[PDB]
Amino acid sequence: TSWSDRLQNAADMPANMDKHALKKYRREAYHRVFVNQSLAMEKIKCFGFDMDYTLAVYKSPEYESLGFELTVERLVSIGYPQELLSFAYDSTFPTRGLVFDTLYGNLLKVDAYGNLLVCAHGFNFIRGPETREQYPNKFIQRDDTERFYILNTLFNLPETYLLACLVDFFTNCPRYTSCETGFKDGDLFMSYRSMFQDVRDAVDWVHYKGSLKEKTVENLEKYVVKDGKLPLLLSRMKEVGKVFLATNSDYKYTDKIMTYLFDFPHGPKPGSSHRPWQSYFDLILVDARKPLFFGEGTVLRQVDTKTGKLKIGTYTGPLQHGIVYSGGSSDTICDLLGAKGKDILYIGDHIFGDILKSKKRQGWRTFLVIPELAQELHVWTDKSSLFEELQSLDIFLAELSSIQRRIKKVTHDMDMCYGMMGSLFRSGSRQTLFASQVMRYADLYAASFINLLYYPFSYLFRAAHVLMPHES
Amino acid sequence: TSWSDRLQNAADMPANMDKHALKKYRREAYHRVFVNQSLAMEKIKCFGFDMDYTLAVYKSPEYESLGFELTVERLVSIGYPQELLSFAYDSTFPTRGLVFDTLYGNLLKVDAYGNLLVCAHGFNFIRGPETREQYPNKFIQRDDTERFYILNTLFNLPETYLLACLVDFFTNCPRYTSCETGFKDGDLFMSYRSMFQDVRDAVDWVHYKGSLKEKTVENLEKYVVKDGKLPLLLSRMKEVGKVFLATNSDYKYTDKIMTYLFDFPHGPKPGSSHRPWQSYFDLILVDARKPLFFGEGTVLRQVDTKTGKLKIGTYTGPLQHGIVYSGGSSDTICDLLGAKGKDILYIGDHIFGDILKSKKRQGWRTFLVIPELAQELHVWTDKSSLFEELQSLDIFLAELSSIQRRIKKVTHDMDMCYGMMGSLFRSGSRQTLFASQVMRYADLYAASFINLLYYPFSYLFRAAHVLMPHES
Amino acid sequence: TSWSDRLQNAADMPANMDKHALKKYRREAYHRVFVNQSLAMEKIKCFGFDMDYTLAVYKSPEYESLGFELTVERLVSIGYPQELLSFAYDSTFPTRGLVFDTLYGNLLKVDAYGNLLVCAHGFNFIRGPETREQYPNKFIQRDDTERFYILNTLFNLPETYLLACLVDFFTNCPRYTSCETGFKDGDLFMSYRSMFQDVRDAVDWVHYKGSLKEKTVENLEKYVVKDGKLPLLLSRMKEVGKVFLATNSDYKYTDKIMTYLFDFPHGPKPGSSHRPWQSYFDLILVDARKPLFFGEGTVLRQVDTKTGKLKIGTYTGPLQHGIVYSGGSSDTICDLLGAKGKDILYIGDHIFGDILKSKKRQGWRTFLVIPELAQELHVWTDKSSLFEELQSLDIFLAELSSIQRRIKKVTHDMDMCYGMMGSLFRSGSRQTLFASQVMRYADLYAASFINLLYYPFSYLFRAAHVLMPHES
Amino acid sequence: TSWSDRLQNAADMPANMDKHALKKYRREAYHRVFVNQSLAMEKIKCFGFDMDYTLAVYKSPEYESLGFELTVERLVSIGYPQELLSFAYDSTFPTRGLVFDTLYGNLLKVDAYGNLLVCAHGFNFIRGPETREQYPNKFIQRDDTERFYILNTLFNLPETYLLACLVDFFTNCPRYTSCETGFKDGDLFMSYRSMFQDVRDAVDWVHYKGSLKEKTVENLEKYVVKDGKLPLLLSRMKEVGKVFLATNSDYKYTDKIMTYLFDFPHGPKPGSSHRPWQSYFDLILVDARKPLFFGEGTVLRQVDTKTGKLKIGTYTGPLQHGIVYSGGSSDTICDLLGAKGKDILYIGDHIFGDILKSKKRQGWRTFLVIPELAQELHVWTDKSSLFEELQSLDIFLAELSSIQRRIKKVTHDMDMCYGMMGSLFRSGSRQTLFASQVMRYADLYAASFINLLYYPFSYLFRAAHVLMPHES
C-alpha cells in the first residue's frame, strides 16, 4: 500500500456532510488538518492552489517509475552505457528531502542544523566512523549550493534513486576506477558533479521536451488520483471567498489535467450539473515561474485559450470572466482579488519554492500538502511501540553503554519500517530538515487539502503557544 | 535597577564551590543556564569567547548614554541642528531588536514572520488601524535590507533611541514640513533613509575614530562590569579543554579591557598569584572581522604585542606560546587547536553575527549571553500574574469581544513593565523575532556565561524533544 | 551581383601558383590582404579557423532569405499575425552593425563614439532635427546593453530587416495604436523591447531547434560557397605550421559542411588523391562557446565521431591523431599545440566575439574575414569620384552654406550605392563603429582568407606607423 | 628643467592679445593645442574644469617628493622597516602609466595591446629573453584588475617610484628571502600583492587623513603653478559661454587652492579690479566622485560655504547665484546649464576617470591636459635626429641583423633622454597604452589648457580624416 493508494481509497468515498459525521471523520489522523500556527478560517478570503502534487496527485510508484524510465532512456540516448536500461525504479529506496553531495557522490539525510543522520554511497550505508573521513564534523553547510543539491520535491524521487543506482553501477563496473570525486575511464574522468548535472539536465529534459507529459495524459487513470469530493470542496470555498490557481505548468497541460480531475457525470455533488473546471476559479494563472513569482515575477500575459498560445503583448486590462493569465507576480493576485496576504490561504506541496517563499516574502497563510503522510501516518501509529521504547531509552540513558547499541538497533528497525532512507520527518528521535521546515513555514498541513472539507466554514485551528526555556 | 546592576551585584559575590551550594545556586533563574538543544559538556574540548558584551559587559545606562552623547555631538559637528544637544538618553525607551523602516521613519517590533507587534513614529505609538495605511498586511519583508535595518546589538541601543528622538524633533520643529518619506526644509529634503545613514555613520565614527574607546578606558569602573569569578571559571575551563578569544576588537583596546577584567590582587582564587590575562588563553585572535570570519575570513596576521601594530606579512608559522593573531578565519582556530566544530562551545552576545553564523556555517556549539535577561527575569517572575491572566484570556476567547479589549489592556500593562518597547522576547503572548532566533541558534543561553561555573565539568544540559503535530 | 557572387566567381578560378602570377593577382584590391598592424608571417606557427562565414561562407541573399522566412514562420507559429507571411527578405535594406534601440524601436548606424549617422523607424529614415526629440545629443551610450543591441554578425542580417518590417507593419496596421515605446492593441501592450526579444528568441530557435541547418545541408550548392583552392591553402599552411579548427558549431553540422567544402575529385591540387577534411587539421575543436572560450572556457570533452555524441567525462589525455575535442578553452589549443598567442593567426568573421576577444584576452594575431568587402570594394572603386568630391567639399568648407546641403546630397547619393543603410564602413566621410573595430582589433583583413594564398610563406605585411599630432 | 618649470616660465609671461602675436605664439609646439578630432569652438557653449593637475598644476618634483615622503612615513608608522626613511624621491625613474604586476612585483610599460615594452623588477631592467619566463607571450591582459594596477595619474608618480624602491630594498636586504611572488621573513610572508595594497592604502591615507593637504596649503608658491593669464582665459570663456567646475576635491581645499590661483592685485587683466574665484563660474560642484559622476552619481547636496560643511538634505532647488553644489551627476550639470553633451568642452588631466568616461558615457567634448608634455616636447624636438634614424632603420630593415642590435641601441638611447622608464607616449617606435588612450578619447590636448587663450573664439580645430587600408 503506497501513499497514493491511501489517498485514492479515501477519494473513492462520497462526502457525508452531516455535521456529526464530519466531526467524527476528522478525529482520525488520516483525515485531519494538522496545525503549526493558529489560523482563524473566517479571516481567509481567498483560497489559492498549485496544481502538480496538490490538485493533481500523481500515483505512486507508477509516476515515479515512468519518470525514472524516461530519464534513464534520455541518459542512454546521450551516451551513457547500455547497462542503465537494466535499472528498475524501487520505491523502497528514496525518501524525499535528501541531499546529494556532488563532491563525494553521497546521498545524505540531515537534520535542521546540517548534522548527518544517514549517509549512503550508492547502496552502501556508511556507518558513523567511516563517515568522519569525508565529514570530519558529521556536518554539511547546506547552503553551499555549488556542492549540495537538496532533493525536496516529489518530482525529485526518481533522480534520488537514479543517483544511487549510477554511483553503484560505476563503482562495481570493472571498466571504471573509483576515485574520491568520481570515476576514471581511461582518459575520461567523470566527476560526481558532472554526473549529477547530467541527471538533473535529463530530468528537466523529460519534463519539458520529452514524452513524460504525453505519456501521463494518455493514461490519466493510471497516473493521477481523482476524487469526486474535489469539486464539492472548491464549490464550498467559493461560497465564502475567492478561489485561484497559480501553477508553474502551461495552459495546455493544465487544461488536460484539470479537465480530468473534474470529469464526473455531475458537478459539486452527485445529481448536480457538471460545470467546467475553469468555473471553480475566480482567477487562473499559469506559467507562474514560482519562486520568482513571489518577488518581481515576470510580465503579465494573457492566454488565448482557443490555441493555448500567449496573446502578443503585456496584459494591462482588468480581471474579467473567462480570462486566463500567464506569468505575473503574487502582487497580480493581490491586486486583482483585492486581497492582502493574510487574507490568503495558499495550498501547495512545494515546501521551499511555494510555501516558504509565499510566507517569507508576502506573509500569506500556508497549507502544505504532504502526500507521503497518507502512508507515513499508518506506519507512525502501527509502530508507535518502537518510538515509545526509543523515547524511554533516551530518558533512561540521560539520567545515568549496552543502552547505546540498543538505541542504534531500535532506531534502525524503526527507520526501516518507512524505507531504506527512513521517515520523511525523522531518523529515530532526530527530526529532519524537512520536518523543521514544515513546522516553520506551513501554518497547516495534511496528507491532502481535501481534509479541509471536514471542518466548518469558520473553524479556528489552534496551535499551543511556544514558551522559551526561561519562561517555562 | 538595570540589568548591569543585577550582573554587578552577582559579580561582587565570591564563589562558594561546595557542590551542594552550587546545585542550590543554579536552581535560581538568575544563575541558571537555559537549554534549547541538548549539550553534553564532556564533549566540549574548546571554549571560545567574544570580548565586547560577553567578557566585557558595559554598564547600563551609563555606557549607552556615553555612546548617545558622542553620536549626538558628531551629528551636530557635521551640521545637524543645535537642538540635538538638548536630547538626553532614556533607557526606558529602546528595547533591542527593533527594525528601523527607512521608508516611513518608524521603529517596528516584529515577530519571527515579520508581523507588526509595535510601531512607533518618533514617540507616537501607532494603533492597529492607523498602521494599515503604511503596512496594509501588518507585515514587513525583513530581508529587504535596502529598506529595513534590524537593530540587533547592544551597541545599537543608543541609535535606537536617537532615531526616535530625531523623528520627533523634525516632526515638531516648525522649520520643517513633515512628508511621508522625510522632511522638507525649503529646498532641502531630508529623507528618513538619509537621516538613518547619517546616524549609522556617526555611531561607526564614534567607535572607530571618535573618543568612545578613550572615554571608556579612562573610567573602566564606571563603564565595565568586573567579576573576580571570571578567572576562576576560565581556569576551570582550561583544566578540561582549550580556551580561545576571537574578537572583532583591536589588540590595544582588547589589552586595556582584558587587563582591567583580570586586575585583582589574586589569580583564579583569592590567595593565588595574579597571572596576566593572556595566560588564560591557548589562542588569542583579534581583528576577527566576524561574520566574514566564519567563511573566507581574511589573511592571518601576527600582532607585535610590544607596539600593538601588525607584523608585516601573512603569518605562516605554528601556534606558539605568547603569539597573538589578527584576522584569519574560523578554520584557523580549528586547525591550530585540533578541533572540529562540535568540540567547540562559542560564547557570545551577537545572536546574528556570531552565534547564528558559527552554528549555520560551521556547526559550532553556541552559548548566547543576553545581558538584559539579568533584569528581564526579575520582571518575568514579579509580573507572572499578568502573563498567566493573559494565557487564561487567550484560552477563554479561543473556546467561544469585551475579552478582546481586555486582552489589549493586559498586553499593554504587561509590556510597559519592561519599557516603552516592551520585552526583548515578546509583546504580550506573541514572541519576537529575537526570541525565535535565540531558540533556533543558541544551544544554551543565560544572562551571563559566568553561570557555567555552577555546573559540574561533565554536566549534560537537556532540552525536551520537539514533536510534530501529527506525532503528538 | 552580391558579395557571395563575387566570392564564388573568384572561387571558380584554379590556382596559378607561378610567382609572378601571384604577385600580379594580389595587386588587385579584390585579392589583397589589408594590413592594420605589421605581421611577419614567418613568426606564425599555427593557423586557426572559425567555420561559419569563414570557411563556410553562406551565399547571399539566399541564406539570409531562408533565415528570414524560417524566423517569420516561427513568430507566426507562436501567435504573431498572419500578415508577417507576406514579408519577403530584401537584401537592399540591412547593412551589418546596426544598433537596435529597444526603447524607441529604431535602427541606428553609429560612429565609434556613439554619434548617430542614420536613424530609421521601420522604413522611415528620420532627418537630423526630428532625431533630436529622442536623441537630444545625437548620441547613444552603446554599452547600455539593457537598451541597445548591436547587430554585428552576418547571422543578424535577417533580423535587422525583420525588425524594420515589424515596426513598419505595426505602425501602419489600424488594429494597433502607435505609442512612444511600442504598440497598444486594446488591453495588450507590445513594447519594442518585448518585440525585439521575441525576434531574438525566434532567430535562436531557428538555428538550434528549427529547420535551418536541415534545409541548408539538403542544398549545399545553393547555400554555401565552395572553392577548390581551399584545400591548397590549408595544405600549404600545414607545410609551415599547425592548423586548427575552433568552431561554435556542433560536430554533426561541422562534419556535413566541411565534407561538402572538401568534396572535389582531388585533394590539395587537381590530380592529387582526395583526403578527408579532418586530415587538414592538427586539432579540431567543436562546441567552442566563444567568447567564453577565451576566458575560463568549459570542460574539455571528446567527441565520439562515429555517433556524433560526446563521450561521458572530461578528457584528460594528450593530443592524438583522429581525436575531436568539444568545449575547452583557448589555453587547450595553446597547450596542445605548444604555442604562445603571438605564434597564432586566428581567422574569423566575428569581429567582437572572436577577433576582439582573442586579441584582447590572449594576444593572438588576427585575420578578419569580411565577406561584404568582396562587393563593397567594387562600389568603392566604381564610385571613387563621389567620395573624392566629398573630400574636396569638406576641405573647401573647412577653409572658409550652399556647400552644406551639397555635402548632404553627395553623402546620400554615395551611401545609397551601397544600400539603404549605406556602407558597412562609413556614412559619407564618417567612419562607422564597425570600421573602427576592424582597424583596432584585426591585424589583417580581407574579403576572404583565401587571399593568403597569393602571398609567399614568409611575407612581411606592413602597416605605416601611427604618430601623435604633437609628433607629426 | 622639469615640466612644471616650463609651465611656470610660460605662466610668468603677460598675455599679448594682439591678433598677430597670438597667431605667431600658437605656431610654437609649446603653446599649441593638438587635435585628434575636429572641433568647432563656436559650437561649444559650456567650458568645464577639473581642479587638481588641471587648474592647480602641482610643481615637480617638489610635490611628488612631498607625497613620497609622507607615504614612506606612513608605512614606517604602521610597521615597515626603518630603512624606508633613507629612500629619497627620484624624478628620473617613474614615467606615468606604468602597470604594477602584483603577482611578480614588476613595473611594466605596455603598448595598447598589452605587449611588454619595458619590464623592471625593483631597479633591474629585465631583457627580452628573461622576460619570457614570467610573460611567455610578452603580454599581459591589462583588465585583469585583480592582478594589474595601472598607475595613470600624476598622483601615482610617488607610488610608482616607491614600489620599485620597496622591491629593491626587500630583494637586497639579507633578513628576507626572495620568492617568486614576494618575500619570506621567517614565519611571515609578504606577497607583492599585500605590499602593493599597503602602498595604495598609505597614499590614500596621506591624501585623505594625513598632512599632505595641510603641507601643500602652507606653502602654495612652492607647490602650485600660478598664472595671471588664468583669469583672463576664464573671463573670455564666460563672454561666449558658461563656465563650470566639477572636482573630486572638497570645498575647503578647493577654496584654498582656487583663492591662491586668483590671488593677484588685479582681475582678468592688469589694471582691472580683483574678483573672487567663485565669480568666474556659473556652476561650482565639489565632491564630484568621478567617474561614478558620469553614471548614477550621488545625491545632490549644497555646501554651506561659511562653514565648509554640507547642508542637511538633498538639494531640490534651482541654480542660483552663489550656491555651491556637492555630489550630483553629469546630468546635474546638463540640466542646470541647459546643455547637451556636445555643447560641453570638459578640461582635465585624468585620461581614464574623466576624459574617457565623459566621452564614452555622455558624449562630452574633451580637452586633455598633459603636464609632462611641457618638457617631453623639448626632448622630442631636441632629439628628433634619434627618432628619425630609428624610422630610417625600421624602413631599411623591413625592405630586406647588425640592424637589429642597432635598433635596440638607438631605442635605448632615445628612451633614456626622457628618463629610466622612457617617454610617456612611446618606447622607441612603439606607442604606449597611454598614447593610444589620448588619441582615442581626447578631442584636443596640450601641456596646459591655457593654450586655448591663443586661438580665437570660433576657431575650427581640424584633424585629418582616418581612412581604412582598403580605402587608401
Side-chain angles (χ1 to χ4, degrees), chain B residues 106-401:
Chain B
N106 301 319
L107 286 164
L108 309 174
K109 189 183 186 174
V110 303
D111 76 4
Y113 297 100
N115 302 312
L116 268 51
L117 304 175
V118 182
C119 173
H121 190 78
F123 306 126
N124 184 23
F125 284 72
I126 306 307
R127 298 171 183 73
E130 186 185 334
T131 289
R132 287 209 185 263
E133 302 164 335
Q134 289 181 337
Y135 307 97
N137 196 38
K138 278 194 182 157
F139 162 88
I140 61 159
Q141 197 287 86
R142 67 181 175 278
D143 297 312
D144 180 1
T145 63
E146 289 290 335
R147 174 167 170 195
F148 302 108
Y149 189 88
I150 307 180
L151 296 149
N152 273 337
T153 78
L154 290 149
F155 292 122
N156 292 142
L157 282 175
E159 80 195 85
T160 301
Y161 181 62
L162 182 51
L163 288 159
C165 286
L166 288 166
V167 177
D168 176 70
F169 169 75
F170 290 113
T171 297
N172 296 109
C173 182
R175 306 198 293 275
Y176 307 88
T177 299
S178 296
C179 303
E180 188 184 41
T181 68
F183 302 99
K184 199 180 179 295
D185 161 25
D187 287 317
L188 297 162
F189 184 79
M190 189 193 50
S191 71
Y192 294 119
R193 180 179 192 145
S194 65
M195 191 192 81
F196 168 80
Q197 193 59 56
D198 284 346
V199 171
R200 196 76 283 297
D201 287 353
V203 175
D204 286 351
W205 186 94
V206 155
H207 279 267
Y208 303 122
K209 299 163 166 159
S211 62
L212 176 59
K213 287 186 162 68
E214 171 177 55
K215 282 175 183 316
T216 304
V217 303
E218 72 178 14
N219 197 346
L220 291 164
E221 296 86 356
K222 182 166 175 173
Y223 290 121
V224 182
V225 174
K226 187 163 168 172
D227 182 2
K229 294 182 300 298
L230 168 68
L232 180 52
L233 175 58
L234 293 193
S235 72
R236 292 172 60 82
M237 289 171 165
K238 216 160 189 254
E239 295 169 27
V240 297
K242 295 179 181 161
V243 179
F244 70 92
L245 182 66
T247 176
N248 281 5
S249 49
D250 57 90
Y251 186 68
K252 276 175 177 135
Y253 184 72
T254 297
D255 191 16
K256 290 287 179 46
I257 294 304
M258 295 296 288
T259 297
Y260 167 79
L261 294 169
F262 283 77
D263 178 22
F264 294 93
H266 59 71
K269 293 167 90 167
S272 70
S273 296
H274 180 268
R275 297 165 34 205
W277 73 261
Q278 299 94 330
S279 75
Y280 291 83
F281 298 89
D282 296 286
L283 186 157
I284 298 169
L285 186 154
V286 294
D287 314 303
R289 300 269 315 277
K290 300 170 286 174
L292 172 59
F293 187 74
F294 298 107
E296 279 181 36
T298 57
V299 158
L300 187 66
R301 306 292 293 283
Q302 176 180 10
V303 176
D304 183 332
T305 55
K306 172 169 202 183
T307 63
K309 305 174 182 174
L310 302 181
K311 302 205 180 182
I312 306 305
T314 300
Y315 184 74
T316 56
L319 185 61
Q320 42 187 329
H321 177 76
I323 188 169
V324 173
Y325 299 104
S326 168
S329 75
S330 57
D331 287 336
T332 305
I333 293 182
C334 287
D335 289 342
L336 292 178
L337 302 184
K340 309 151 204 179
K342 283 159 192 172
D343 300 332
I344 297 164
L345 185 63
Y346 192 70
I347 301 162
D349 64 301
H350 194 353
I351 180 55
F352 180 86
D354 295 7
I355 295 317
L356 179 160
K357 293 284 181 176
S358 69
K359 176 58 69 177
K360 289 196 87 182
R361 304 280 298 180
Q362 300 297 345
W364 288 14
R365 310 310 300 269
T366 53
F367 184 116
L368 181 72
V369 172
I370 314 177
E372 311 98 304
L373 191 58
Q375 181 55 21
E376 291 235 0
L377 278 169
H378 283 276
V379 178
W380 177 262
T381 184
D382 291 0
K383 293 304 207 295
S384 61
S385 80
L386 273 61
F387 188 76
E388 278 165 275
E389 180 181 351
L390 191 54
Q391 274 170 322
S392 306
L393 285 165
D394 295 342
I395 287 162
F396 203 94
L397 178 66
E399 272 166 327
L400 223 64
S401 266

Side-chain angles (χ1 to χ4, degrees), chain D residues 5-14 25 30-31 227 229 450 454:
Chain D
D5 294 335
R6 300 300 190 175
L7 293 173
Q8 185 65 68
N9 290 345
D12 294 338
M13 300 314 301
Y25 206 60
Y30 319 119
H31 311 302
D227 182 2
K229 294 182 300 298
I450 203 71
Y454 315 129

Side-chain angles (χ1 to χ4, degrees), chain A residues 113 115 342 440 445 470, chain B residues 113 115 342 440 445 470:
Chain A
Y113 297 100
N115 302 312
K342 283 159 192 172
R440 183 141 51 114
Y445 72 93
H470 79 265
Chain B
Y113 297 100
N115 302 312
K342 283 159 192 172
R440 183 141 51 114
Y445 72 93
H470 79 265

Side-chain angles (χ1 to χ4, degrees), chain C residues 407-424:
Chain C
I407 284 162
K408 290 190 214 302
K409 189 189 200 315
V410 176
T411 293
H412 181 259
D413 294 340
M414 184 193 121
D415 289 355
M416 289 309 95
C417 292
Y418 295 89
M420 291 291 263
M421 286 282 178
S423 176
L424 180 56

Side-chain angles (χ1 to χ4, degrees), chain D residues 95 173 192 279 323 422 451:
Chain D
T95 297
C173 182
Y192 294 119
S279 75
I323 188 169
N451 293 350

Side-chain angles (χ1 to χ4, degrees), chain A residues 396-444:
Chain A
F396 203 94
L397 178 66
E399 272 166 327
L400 223 64
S401 266
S402 189
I403 288 161
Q404 287 173 312
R405 75 192 177 80
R406 183 77 213 164
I407 284 162
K408 290 190 214 302
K409 189 189 200 315
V410 176
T411 293
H412 181 259
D413 294 340
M414 184 193 121
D415 289 355
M416 289 309 95
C417 292
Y418 295 89
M420 291 291 263
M421 286 282 178
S423 176
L424 180 56
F425 302 109
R426 53 179 53 261
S427 165
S429 66
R430 303 179 72 183
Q431 298 192 289
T432 56
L433 168 64
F434 189 98
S436 82
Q437 293 171 332
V438 174
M439 290 177 76
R440 183 141 51 114
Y441 298 107
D443 290 313
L444 309 170

Side-chain angles (χ1 to χ4, degrees), chain B residues 68 72-73 75-77 79-88 161-162 165-166 168-170 172-176 185:
Chain B
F68 180 87
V72 165
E73 286 171 355
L75 292 165
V76 170
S77 75
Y80 274 71
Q82 291 289 295
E83 292 96 336
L84 270 65
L85 300 176
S86 74
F87 297 166
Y161 181 62
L162 182 51
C165 286
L166 288 166
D168 176 70
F169 169 75
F170 290 113
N172 296 109
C173 182
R175 306 198 293 275
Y176 307 88
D185 161 25

